Amino acid sequence: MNIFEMLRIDEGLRLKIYKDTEGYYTIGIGHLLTKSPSLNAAKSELDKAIGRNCNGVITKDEAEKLFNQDVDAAVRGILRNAKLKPVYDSLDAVRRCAAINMVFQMGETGVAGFTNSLRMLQQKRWDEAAVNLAKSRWYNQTPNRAKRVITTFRTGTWDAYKNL
Ligand SMILES: CCCCCCc1ccccc1
């Protein structure tokens, strides 16, 4: 298991524009195109992202390229964020994947809300962190994914993903 396999399980793979769990136009392996209600706006973003006229459809290779870029961007975002970097640097390799997973899903605008979770993770209080992380819109709206990510933080193992 690695971050690519983990996120591929959590995000799936679809080659045509679809709506994500929040109703937003998305493609590939959880590549958000726009939060605009306009499908035309989403198609413009897709064509810009891929560099050709896609008419709402991409290849698997194109999906995997966007995914590589998106994982890289999630990691760089963590490294650039004064609140996230010290916590990330304190984690082992498996838990670092859980961190990247959350940033990939939610971005960074809600980082302050996770202040207490971050402190518990830095303190290596894994069970307490797991309890705190579940007290969230994130957990309530995507509970199965959140449970997998939280189990990964709690245990530092891939147990929640193995079967998958
Ligand atoms: C969406 C913010 C989640 C913060 C807690 C998990 C995490 C993410 C990134 C680096 C360290 C910890």
Coordinates of all heavy atoms in Angstrom, one line a residue, residues 48-128, unseen atoms left out:
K48 N -8.5 22.9 -20.3 CA -7.3 23.7 -19.8 C -6.4 22.7 -19.0 O -5.1 22.8 -19.2 CB -7.8 24.8 -18.9 CG -6.6 25.6 -18.3 CD -7.1 27.0 -17.7 CE -8.3 26.8 -16.7 NZ -7.9 26.5 -15.3
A49 N -6.9 21.8 -18.2 CA -6.1 20.9 -17.4 C -5.4 19.9 -18.3 O -4.2 19.5 -18.0 CB -6.9 20.2 -16.4
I50 N -6.0 19.4 -19.3 CA -5.5 18.4 -20.2 C -4.7 18.9 -21.4 O -3.8 18.3 -21.9 CB -6.6 17.4 -20.7 CG1 -7.4 16.9 -19.5 CG2 -6.0 16.3 -21.6 CD1 -6.6 16.0 -18.6
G51 N -5.1 20.1 -21.8 CA -4.4 20.8 -22.9 C -4.9 20.4 -24.3 O -4.2 20.5 -25.3
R52 N -6.2 19.9 -24.4 CA -6.8 19.6 -25.6 C -8.3 19.7 -25.4 O -8.8 19.8 -24.3 CB -6.4 18.2 -26.1 CG -7.0 17.1 -25.3 CD -6.6 15.7 -25.8 NE -7.1 14.7 -24.9 CZ -8.3 14.1 -25.0 NH1 -9.2 14.5 -25.9 NH2 -8.7 13.2 -24.1
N53 N -9.1 19.6 -26.5 CA -10.5 19.7 -26.4 C -11.0 18.3 -26.1 O -11.0 17.4 -27.0 CB -11.1 20.2 -27.7 CG -10.7 21.6 -28.0 OD1 -10.6 22.4 -27.1 ND2 -10.5 22.0 -29.3
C54 N -11.5 18.0 -24.9 CA -11.8 16.7 -24.4 C -13.3 16.4 -24.5 O -13.7 15.2 -24.5 CB -11.4 16.6 -22.9 SG -9.7 16.8 -22.6
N55 N -14.1 17.4 -24.6 CA -15.6 17.3 -24.6 C -16.0 16.3 -23.4 O -16.9 15.5 -23.6 CB -16.1 16.7 -25.9 CG -17.6 16.9 -26.0 OD1 -18.2 17.8 -25.4 ND2 -18.2 15.9 -26.7
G56 N -15.4 16.5 -22.3 CA -15.9 15.9 -21.0 C -15.4 14.4 -20.8 O -15.9 13.8 -19.9
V57 N -14.5 14.0 -21.6 CA -13.9 12.6 -21.5 C -12.4 12.6 -21.6 O -11.8 13.3 -22.4 CB -14.5 11.7 -22.6 CG1 -14.0 10.3 -22.5 CG2 -16.1 11.7 -22.6
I58 N -11.8 11.8 -20.8 CA -10.3 11.7 -20.8 C -9.9 10.2 -20.9 O -10.7 9.3 -20.7 CB -9.6 12.4 -19.6 CG1 -10.0 11.8 -18.3 CG2 -9.8 13.9 -19.7 CD1 -9.3 12.3 -17.1
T59 N -8.6 9.9 -21.2 CA -8.1 8.6 -21.1 C -7.6 8.2 -19.7 O -7.4 9.1 -18.9 CB -6.9 8.4 -22.1 OG1 -5.8 9.2 -21.7 CG2 -7.3 8.8 -23.5
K60 N -7.3 6.9 -19.5 CA -6.8 6.5 -18.2 C -5.4 7.2 -18.0 O -5.1 7.6 -16.9 CB -6.7 5.0 -18.1 CG -6.2 4.5 -16.8 CD -6.4 2.9 -16.7 CE -6.1 2.4 -15.3
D61 N -4.6 7.3 -19.0 CA -3.3 7.9 -18.9 C -3.4 9.3 -18.4 O -2.7 9.8 -17.6 CB -2.5 7.8 -20.2 CG -2.0 6.4 -20.5 OD1 -2.2 5.5 -19.7 OD2 -1.4 6.3 -21.6
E62 N -4.4 10.0 -19.0 CA -4.6 11.4 -18.6 C -5.1 11.5 -17.2 O -4.7 12.4 -16.4 CB -5.6 12.1 -19.6 CG -5.0 12.4 -21.0 CD -5.9 12.7 -22.1 OE1 -7.2 12.4 -21.9 OE2 -5.5 13.2 -23.1
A63 N -6.0 10.6 -16.8 CA -6.5 10.6 -15.4 C -5.3 10.4 -14.4 O -5.2 11.0 -13.4 CB -7.5 9.5 -15.2
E64 N -4.4 9.5 -14.8 CA -3.3 9.2 -13.9 C -2.3 10.3 -13.9 O -1.7 10.6 -12.8 CB -2.6 7.9 -14.3 CG -3.5 6.7 -14.0 CD -3.1 5.4 -14.7 OE1 -2.3 5.4 -15.6 OE2 -3.5 4.3 -14.2
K65 N -2.2 11.1 -15.0 CA -1.3 12.3 -14.9 C -1.9 13.3 -14.0 O -1.1 13.9 -13.2 CB -1.1 12.8 -16.3 CG -0.2 14.0 -16.4 CD 0.3 14.3 -17.8 CE 1.5 15.3 -17.7 NZ 2.1 15.5 -19.1
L66 N -3.2 13.6 -14.1 CA -3.8 14.6 -13.2 C -3.6 14.1 -11.7 O -3.4 14.9 -10.9 CB -5.3 14.8 -13.5 CG -5.7 15.4 -14.8 CD1 -7.2 15.5 -15.0 CD2 -5.0 16.8 -15.0
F67 N -3.8 12.8 -11.5 CA -3.6 12.2 -10.2 C -2.2 12.5 -9.6 O -2.1 12.9 -8.5 CB -4.0 10.7 -10.2 CG -4.1 10.0 -8.9 CD1 -4.6 10.6 -7.8 CD2 -3.7 8.7 -8.8 CE1 -4.7 9.9 -6.6 CE2 -3.8 8.0 -7.7 CZ -4.3 8.6 -6.5
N68 N -1.2 12.2 -10.4 CA 0.2 12.5 -10.0 C 0.4 13.9 -9.6 O 0.9 14.3 -8.6 CB 1.2 12.1 -11.2 CG 1.4 10.7 -11.3 OD1 1.3 9.9 -10.3 ND2 1.7 10.2 -12.5
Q69 N -0.2 14.8 -10.5 CA -0.1 16.3 -10.2 C -0.8 16.6 -8.9 O -0.3 17.4 -8.1 CB -0.6 17.1 -11.3 CG 0.2 17.0 -12.6 CD -0.4 17.7 -13.8 OE1 -1.6 18.1 -13.7 NE2 0.3 17.7 -14.8
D70 N -2.0 16.0 -8.7 CA -2.8 16.3 -7.5 C -2.2 15.8 -6.2 O -2.3 16.5 -5.2 CB -4.2 15.8 -7.7 CG -5.0 16.5 -8.8 OD1 -4.6 17.6 -9.2 OD2 -6.0 16.0 -9.3
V71 N -1.6 14.7 -6.2 CA -0.9 14.1 -5.0 C 0.3 15.0 -4.7 O 0.5 15.4 -3.6 CB -0.5 12.7 -5.2 CG1 0.4 12.2 -4.1 CG2 -1.8 11.8 -5.3
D72 N 1.1 15.3 -5.7 CA 2.2 16.3 -5.6 C 1.8 17.6 -5.0 O 2.4 18.1 -4.0 CB 2.9 16.4 -6.9 CG 4.1 17.4 -6.9 OD1 4.0 18.4 -6.5 OD2 5.0 17.0 -7.6
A73 N 0.8 18.2 -5.5 CA 0.2 19.4 -5.0 C -0.2 19.3 -3.5 O 0.0 20.2 -2.8 CB -0.9 19.9 -5.8
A74 N -0.9 18.2 -3.2 CA -1.3 18.0 -1.8 C -0.1 17.9 -0.8 O -0.1 18.6 0.2 CB -2.1 16.7 -1.7
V75 N 1.0 17.2 -1.2 CA 2.2 17.1 -0.5 C 2.9 18.5 -0.3 O 3.2 18.9 0.8 CB 3.2 16.1 -1.1 CG1 4.5 16.2 -0.3 CG2 2.6 14.7 -1.0
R76 N 3.0 19.2 -1.5 CA 3.6 20.5 -1.4 C 2.8 21.5 -0.5 O 3.4 22.3 0.2 CB 3.7 21.1 -2.8 CG 4.8 20.5 -3.6 CD 5.0 21.2 -4.9 NE 6.0 20.6 -5.7 CZ 7.3 20.8 -5.7 NH1 7.8 21.7 -4.9 NH2 8.1 20.1 -6.5
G77 N 1.5 21.4 -0.6 CA 0.6 22.2 0.3 C 0.9 22.0 1.7 O 1.0 22.9 2.5
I78 N 1.1 20.7 2.1 CA 1.4 20.4 3.5 C 2.8 21.0 3.9 O 2.9 21.6 4.9 CB 1.5 18.9 3.7 CG1 0.0 18.3 3.7 CG2 2.2 18.5 5.0 CD1 -0.1 16.8 3.6
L79 N 3.7 20.9 3.0 CA 5.1 21.4 3.3 C 5.1 22.9 3.4 O 6.0 23.4 4.2 CB 6.1 20.9 2.3 CG 6.3 19.3 2.2 CD1 7.3 19.0 1.2 CD2 6.7 18.8 3.6
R80 N 4.3 23.6 2.7 CA 4.2 25.0 2.7 C 3.3 25.6 3.9 O 3.3 26.8 4.0 CB 3.7 25.6 1.4 CG 4.7 25.4 0.3 CD 4.3 25.9 -1.1 NE 5.4 25.5 -1.9 CZ 5.5 25.6 -3.2 NH1 4.5 26.3 -3.9 NH2 6.5 25.1 -3.8
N81 N 2.6 24.8 4.6 CA 1.7 25.2 5.6 C 2.3 25.1 7.0 O 2.6 24.0 7.4 CB 0.4 24.3 5.5 CG -0.7 24.9 6.4 OD1 -0.6 24.9 7.6 ND2 -1.8 25.3 5.7
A82 N 2.4 26.2 7.6 CA 3.1 26.3 8.9 C 2.4 25.4 10.0 O 3.1 25.0 11.0 CB 3.2 27.7 9.4
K83 N 1.1 25.2 9.9 CA 0.4 24.4 10.9 C 0.5 22.9 10.5 O 0.6 22.1 11.4 CB -1.1 24.8 10.9 CG -1.3 26.2 11.5 CD -2.8 26.6 11.3
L84 N 0.6 22.6 9.3 CA 0.6 21.2 8.9 C 2.0 20.5 8.8 O 2.1 19.4 9.2 CB -0.1 21.0 7.5 CG -1.6 21.4 7.4 CD1 -2.0 21.2 6.0 CD2 -2.4 20.6 8.4
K85 N 3.0 21.3 8.4 CA 4.3 20.7 8.2 C 4.9 20.1 9.5 O 5.4 18.9 9.4 CB 5.3 21.7 7.6 CG 6.6 21.1 7.3 CD 7.6 22.1 6.7 CE 8.9 21.4 6.2 NZ 9.6 20.7 7.3
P86 N 4.8 20.7 10.6 CA 5.4 20.1 11.8 C 4.7 18.8 12.2 O 5.4 17.8 12.6 CB 5.3 21.1 12.9 CG 4.4 22.2 12.4 CD 4.4 22.1 10.9
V87 N 3.4 18.8 12.0 CA 2.7 17.5 12.3 C 3.1 16.4 11.3 O 3.4 15.3 11.7 CB 1.2 17.8 12.4 CG1 0.5 16.5 12.8 CG2 0.8 18.9 13.3
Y88 N 3.1 16.8 10.1 CA 3.4 15.8 9.0 C 4.8 15.3 9.2 O 5.0 14.0 9.2 CB 3.3 16.5 7.7 CG 3.6 15.7 6.5 CD1 2.7 14.8 5.9 CD2 4.9 15.7 5.9 CE1 2.9 14.0 4.8 CE2 5.2 15.0 4.8 CZ 4.2 14.1 4.3 OH 4.5 13.4 3.1
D89 N 5.8 16.1 9.5 CA 7.2 15.7 9.7 C 7.3 14.8 10.9 O 8.2 13.9 11.0 CB 8.1 16.9 9.9 CG 8.4 17.6 8.6 OD1 8.1 17.1 7.6 OD2 9.0 18.7 8.7
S90 N 6.4 14.9 11.9 CA 6.4 14.1 13.1 C 5.9 12.7 12.9 O 6.1 11.8 13.7 CB 5.7 14.7 14.3 OG 4.3 14.6 14.1
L91 N 5.1 12.5 11.8 CA 4.4 11.2 11.5 C 5.4 10.2 10.8 O 6.3 10.6 10.1 CB 3.2 11.4 10.7 CG 2.1 12.3 11.2 CD1 1.1 12.6 10.2 CD2 1.5 11.7 12.4
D92 N 5.1 8.9 11.1 CA 5.6 7.8 10.3 C 5.0 7.8 8.9 O 4.1 8.5 8.6 CB 5.3 6.5 11.0 CG 3.8 6.4 11.2 OD1 3.3 6.9 12.2 OD2 3.2 5.8 10.3
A93 N 5.6 6.9 8.1 CA 5.2 6.9 6.6 C 3.8 6.5 6.4 O 3.1 7.1 5.5 CB 6.1 5.9 5.9
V94 N 3.2 5.6 7.2 CA 1.8 5.2 7.0 C 0.9 6.4 7.3 O 0.0 6.7 6.6 CB 1.5 4.0 7.7 CG1 0.0 3.6 7.6 CG2 2.3 2.8 7.2
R95 N 1.1 6.9 8.5 CA 0.3 8.1 8.9 C 0.4 9.3 8.0 O -0.5 10.0 7.8 CB 0.5 8.4 10.4 CG 0.1 7.3 11.3 CD 0.2 7.6 12.8 NE -0.4 6.7 13.7 CZ 0.3 5.7 14.3 NH1 1.6 5.5 14.0 NH2 -0.4 4.9 15.1
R96 N 1.6 9.5 7.4 CA 1.8 10.5 6.5 C 0.8 10.4 5.3 O 0.3 11.4 4.8 CB 3.2 10.6 5.9 CG 4.2 11.2 6.9 CD 5.6 11.4 6.4 NE 6.4 12.0 7.4 CZ 7.8 11.9 7.4 NH1 8.4 11.4 6.4 NH2 8.5 12.5 8.4
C97 N 0.5 9.1 4.9 CA -0.4 8.9 3.8 C -1.8 9.3 4.2 O -2.6 9.9 3.4 CB -0.4 7.4 3.4 SG 1.1 6.9 2.6
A98 N -2.2 9.0 5.5 CA -3.5 9.5 6.0 C -3.6 11.0 5.9 O -4.7 11.5 5.6 CB -3.7 9.0 7.4
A99 N -2.6 11.7 6.3 CA -2.5 13.2 6.2 C -2.7 13.7 4.8 O -3.5 14.6 4.5 CB -1.2 13.7 6.8
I100 N -2.0 13.1 3.9 CA -2.1 13.5 2.5 C -3.5 13.2 2.0 O -4.1 14.0 1.2 CB -1.1 12.7 1.6 CG1 0.4 13.2 2.0 CG2 -1.3 13.1 0.1 CD1 1.4 12.2 1.4
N101 N -4.1 12.1 2.3 CA -5.4 11.7 1.9 C -6.4 12.8 2.3 O -7.2 13.3 1.5 CB -5.8 10.4 2.6 CG -7.0 9.8 2.0 OD1 -8.1 10.4 1.9 ND2 -6.9 8.5 1.5
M102 N -6.4 13.3 3.6 CA -7.3 14.3 4.1 C -7.1 15.6 3.3 O -8.1 16.3 2.9 CB -7.1 14.6 5.5 CG -7.5 13.4 6.4 SD -7.5 13.8 8.2 CE -9.0 14.9 8.3
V103 N -5.9 16.1 3.0 CA -5.6 17.3 2.3 C -6.0 17.2 0.9 O -6.5 18.1 0.2 CB -4.0 17.6 2.4 CG1 -3.7 18.8 1.5 CG2 -3.6 17.9 3.8
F104 N -5.9 16.0 0.3 CA -6.3 15.7 -1.1 C -7.9 15.9 -1.1 O -8.4 16.6 -2.0 CB -5.9 14.3 -1.5 CG -6.2 14.0 -2.9 CD1 -5.2 14.0 -3.9 CD2 -7.5 13.6 -3.3 CE1 -5.5 13.7 -5.2 CE2 -7.8 13.3 -4.6 CZ -6.8 13.3 -5.6
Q105 N -8.6 15.4 -0.1 CA -10.0 15.4 -0.2 C -10.5 16.8 0.1 O -11.5 17.3 -0.6 CB -10.6 14.5 0.9 CG -12.2 14.4 0.8 CD -12.8 13.4 1.8 OE1 -12.1 12.8 2.5 NE2 -14.1 13.4 1.9
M106 N -10.0 17.5 1.1 CA -10.6 18.7 1.7 C -9.8 20.0 1.4 O -10.3 21.1 1.7 CB -10.8 18.6 3.1 CG -11.9 17.5 3.5 SD -12.2 17.4 5.2 CE -10.8 16.5 5.8
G107 N -8.6 19.9 0.9 CA -7.7 21.1 0.8 C -7.3 21.6 2.2 O -7.4 20.9 3.2
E108 N -7.0 22.9 2.2 CA -6.5 23.5 3.4 C -7.3 24.6 4.1 O -6.9 25.2 5.1 CB -5.1 24.0 3.1 CG -4.1 22.9 2.8 CD -2.7 23.5 2.3 OE1 -2.4 24.6 2.8 OE2 -2.0 22.8 1.5
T109 N -8.4 24.9 3.5 CA -9.2 26.1 4.0 C -9.8 25.8 5.4 O -10.1 26.7 6.1 CB -10.3 26.5 3.1 OG1 -11.3 25.5 2.9 CG2 -9.8 26.9 1.7
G110 N -9.9 24.5 5.7 CA -10.5 24.1 7.0 C -9.5 23.7 8.1 O -9.8 23.1 9.1
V111 N -8.2 24.0 7.8 CA -7.1 23.5 8.7 C -7.3 24.0 10.2 O -7.0 23.2 11.1 CB -5.7 23.8 8.2 CG1 -4.7 23.8 9.3 CG2 -5.4 22.9 7.0
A112 N -7.7 25.2 10.4 CA -7.9 25.7 11.7 C -8.9 24.9 12.5 O -8.8 24.7 13.7 CB -8.3 27.2 11.7
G113 N -10.0 24.4 11.9 CA -10.9 23.5 12.5 C -10.3 22.3 13.1 O -10.8 21.7 14.1
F114 N -9.2 21.8 12.5 CA -8.5 20.6 13.0 C -7.4 20.9 13.9 O -6.6 20.0 14.2 CB -8.1 19.8 11.7 CG -9.2 19.1 11.0 CD1 -9.9 19.7 10.0 CD2 -9.6 17.8 11.4 CE1 -10.9 19.1 9.3 CE2 -10.7 17.2 10.7 CZ -11.3 17.8 9.7
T115 N -7.3 22.1 14.5 CA -6.3 22.4 15.4 C -6.1 21.4 16.6 O -5.0 21.0 16.9 CB -6.5 23.8 16.0 OG1 -6.5 24.8 15.0 CG2 -5.4 24.2 17.0
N116 N -7.2 21.0 17.2 CA -7.1 20.0 18.3 C -6.6 18.7 17.8 O -5.8 18.0 18.5 CB -8.4 20.0 19.1 CG -8.7 21.4 19.6 OD1 -7.9 22.1 20.1 ND2 -10.0 21.8 19.4
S117 N -7.1 18.2 16.7 CA -6.7 16.9 16.1 C -5.2 16.9 15.8 O -4.5 16.0 16.1 CB -7.5 16.6 14.8 OG -8.8 16.3 15.1
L118 N -4.8 18.0 15.2 CA -3.3 18.2 14.8 C -2.5 18.1 16.1 O -1.4 17.4 16.0 CB -3.1 19.5 14.1 CG -3.6 19.6 12.7 CD1 -3.7 21.0 12.2 CD2 -2.7 18.7 11.8
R119 N -2.9 18.7 17.2 CA -2.1 18.7 18.4 C -2.0 17.2 18.9 O -1.0 16.8 19.3 CB -2.7 19.6 19.5 CG -1.9 19.7 20.8 CD -2.6 20.5 21.8 NE -3.8 19.7 22.3 CZ -5.1 20.1 22.0 NH1 -5.3 21.2 21.3 NH2 -6.1 19.4 22.5
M120 N -3.2 16.5 18.9 CA -3.2 15.2 19.4 C -2.3 14.3 18.5 O -1.6 13.4 19.1 CB -4.6 14.6 19.4 CG -5.5 15.4 20.5 SD -7.2 14.9 20.3 CE -8.0 16.2 21.3
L121 N -2.3 14.5 17.2 CA -1.5 13.7 16.3 C 0.0 14.0 16.6 O 0.8 13.0 16.7 CB -1.8 14.0 14.9 CG -3.1 13.5 14.4 CD1 -3.4 14.0 13.0 CD2 -3.2 12.0 14.3
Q122 N 0.4 15.2 16.7 CA 1.7 15.6 17.1 C 2.2 15.0 18.4 O 3.3 14.6 18.5 CB 1.8 17.1 17.2 CG 3.2 17.6 17.3 CD 3.3 18.8 16.5 OE1 3.7 18.8 15.4 NE2 2.8 19.8 16.9
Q123 N 1.3 14.9 19.4 CA 1.5 14.3 20.7 C 1.5 12.7 20.6 O 1.8 12.1 21.6 CB 0.5 14.7 21.7 CG 0.6 16.2 22.1 CD -0.5 16.6 23.0 OE1 -1.7 16.2 22.8 NE2 -0.3 17.5 23.9
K124 N 1.2 12.2 19.5 CA 1.1 10.7 19.3 C 0.0 10.1 20.2 O 0.2 8.9 20.7 CB 2.4 10.0 19.4 CG 3.4 10.6 18.4 CD 4.6 9.7 18.2 CE 5.6 10.3 17.1 NZ 4.9 10.4 15.8
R125 N -1.0 10.8 20.5 CA -2.2 10.3 21.3 C -3.2 9.8 20.3 O -4.2 10.5 20.0 CB -2.7 11.5 22.2 CG -1.7 11.9 23.2 CD -2.2 13.0 24.1 NE -1.1 13.4 25.0 CZ -1.2 14.2 26.1 NH1 -2.4 14.8 26.3 NH2 -0.2 14.5 26.8
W126 N -2.9 8.6 19.7 CA -3.6 8.1 18.6 C -5.1 7.9 18.8 O -5.9 8.2 17.9 CB -2.9 6.9 18.0 CG -1.5 7.0 17.8 CD1 -0.5 6.2 18.3 CD2 -0.8 8.0 16.9 NE1 0.7 6.6 17.8 CE2 0.6 7.7 17.0 CE3 -1.2 9.1 16.2 CZ2 1.5 8.4 16.3 CZ3 -0.2 9.8 15.5 CH2 1.1 9.5 15.5
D127 N -5.5 7.3 19.9 CA -6.9 7.0 20.1 C -7.6 8.3 20.4 O -8.8 8.5 19.9 CB -7.1 6.1 21.3 CG -6.8 4.6 21.0 OD1 -6.0 4.3 20.1 OD2 -7.2 3.7 21.8
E128 N -7.1 9.3 21.1 CA -7.7 10.5 21.3 C -7.8 11.3 20.0 O -8.9 11.9 19.7 CB -6.9 11.4 22.3 CG -6.8 10.7 23.7 CD -6.0 11.5 24.6 OE1 -6.2 12.7 24.8 OE2 -5.1 10.9 25.3

